């Protein structure tokens, strides 16, 4: 009674997730030191 017989039945076996870094890099605002900001809704 090898383990390979029961390898397919994943519901029986313990599940442990390989924890790892996932996601996407945050986007920073770089332009602001160069630019003078003027804000008016009626432009």
């Amino acid at each position: 009674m090898t383990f390979s017989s029961t390898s397919n039945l994943k519901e029986l076996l313990r599940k442990v997730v390989l924890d790892v870094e996932l996601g996407r890099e945050q986007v920073q605002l770089l332009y602001k030191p160069i630019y003078d900001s003027i804000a008016d809704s009626n432009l």
């Binding site: 605002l29 160069i34 630019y35 003078d36 432009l43």
Partner: protein
């Protein structure tokens, strides 16, 4: 679809709002920096690789960046902010620091550079198509006089609004974000550098 919001537990509007902010922020860099990269500079605004020499350390950008500072003081531009690619971060950070002795020559640290920003591009694969904003080409830099010839026109910052659902199909509200924004740039503020 309404089913997707309910049954797909991982899915939520927070991911969509997060992507709106990421795409929104990435595009703000595009409008406000692409004129600097894309502008057709003339010989007056272009400083060639003045370092050259023969067998210099790659902190011979110090020679090129120094002339660019000189070429701005002449014509009274007085560049204060340097924009380059992130590839040249190591060499530029060396020159802006106290570069070590070389052939007995002690090269002083470059001064009057308040800020250095490394604007790499940005890219996303939406659907079956890829959209990207080009960053600063590696081997180039731009001394910038800030806030005088550069003005950011902000009519609407950002307005995400949920809109036309379809009750007959149980499809959730379409969420649409939009802006009314622009930029003003100049050639009187910039001096291009090579390497």
């Amino acid at each position: 679809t309404k089913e997707m919001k309910d049954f797909n537990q991982t899915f939520s509007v927070e991911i969509l709002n997060k992507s709106i902010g990421e795409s929104y922020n990435a595009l703000l860099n595009h409008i406000h920096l692409s004129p600097i990269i894309n502008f057709n500079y003339k010989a007056s605004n272009k400083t060639a690789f003045k370092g050259e020499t023969n067998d210099p350390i790659w902190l011979g950008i110090w020679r090129t960046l120094t002339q660019a500072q000189k070429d701005t003081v002449i014509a009274k531009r007085q560049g204060n902010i340097l924009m380059a690619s992130s590839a040249d971060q190591i060499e530029i950070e060396m020159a802006l620091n106290g570069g070590h002795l070389l052939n007995g020559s002690m090269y002083p640290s470059i001064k009057n550079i308040s800020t250095v920003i490394y604007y790499d591009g940005w890219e996303v694969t939406v659907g079956k198509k890829t959209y990207s904003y080009k960053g600063v080409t590696p081997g180039k830099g731009y001394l910038i006089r800030p806030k005088r010839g550069f003005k950011e026109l902000i009519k609407r910052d950002l307005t995400t609004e949920v809109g036309n659902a379809d009750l007959s199909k149980l499809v959730e509200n379409q969420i649409v974000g939009h802006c009314y924004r622009g930029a003003f740039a100049a050639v009187e503020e910039n001096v291009q550098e090579i390497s």
